[PDB]
């Protein structure tokens, strides 16, 4: 019958007390003639009823989609609490159950290293500014770039990759105009992680 997918909070939300982290439960393949869907939430077994369920949406493919959203406590996710979503639909022999938590393991502090363009790339109109972030655990992280107190949005970051020592690493690439670089402008790569003091760190990069 219908299928269920449970999603974890955005890394940035669990780290900033200003933000609101949530776990999302999505139900797909709900029948028109068996459309009644019910969600049940539990945090480490204890059921909670603060979840907010969104109005189904008839999918362009002639099926359905229902979503419930359970707002969660930063510390709870960060401390390993398990979230289970239970979906009951008449088209199921028995209700479907999905659970999720933060990866298990001792957190490892990420090390941030900024690297200037390759000489060979200076022959171009645009150059790549690199931020390598390695040795962090778990894989949940957020990387951004700024400059002159303002954000730089012309960057792409790779997904985290499992290193040989059980930690993860990734690279973020900020592309800028050679002139903006050669003009000594300063760029910073900031990182947000659980194992970072105050969940934050920065590393600057400029010419010399």
């Amino acid at each position: 019958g219908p299928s269920v997918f449970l999603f974890p909070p955005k890394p940035k939300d669990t780290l900033m007390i200003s933000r609101t982290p949530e776990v999302t439960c999505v139900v797909v393949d709900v029948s028109h003639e068996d459309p009644e869907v019910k969600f049940n939430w539990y945090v480490d077994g204890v059921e909670v009823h603060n979840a907010k369920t969104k109005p189904r949406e008839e999918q362009y493919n002639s099926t359905y989609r229902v979503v419930s959203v359970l707002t969660v406590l930063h510390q709870d996710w960060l401390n390993g609490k398990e979230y289970k979503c239970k979906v009951s639909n008449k088209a199921l022999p028995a209700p479907i159950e999905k659970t999720i938590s933060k990866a298990k393991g001792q957190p490892r502090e990420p090390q941030v290293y900024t690297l200037p363009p390759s000489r060979d790339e200076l022959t171009k109109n645009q150059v790549s500014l690199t931020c390598l972030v390695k040795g962090f655990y778990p894989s949940d992280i957020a990387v951004e770039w700024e400059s002159n107190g303002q954000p730089e949005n012309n960057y792409k970051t790779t997904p985290p990759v499992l290193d040989s020592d059980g930690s993860f690493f990734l690279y973020s690439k900020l592309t800028v105009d050679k002139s903006r670089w050669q003009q000594g402008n300063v760029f910073s790569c900031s990182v947000m992680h659980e194992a970072l003091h105050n969940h934050y760190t920065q590393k600057s990069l400029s010419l010399s």
């Binding site: 900033m16 007390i17 200003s18 930063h74 510390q75 003091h197």
Partner: protein, 34 residues
């Protein structure tokens, strides 16, 4: 973001004197006036 909010939150989150109920209560306080 209030760097004051992030520091207090972080401290409360790691304060060994607070048990879960205490931490949760302190963090809620930080959150509400953040």
């Amino acid at each position: 973001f209030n760097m004051q909010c992030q520091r207090r939150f972080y401290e409360a989150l790691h304060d060994p004197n607070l048990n879960e109920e205490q931490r949760n209560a302190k963090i809620k306080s930080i959150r509400d006036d953040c």
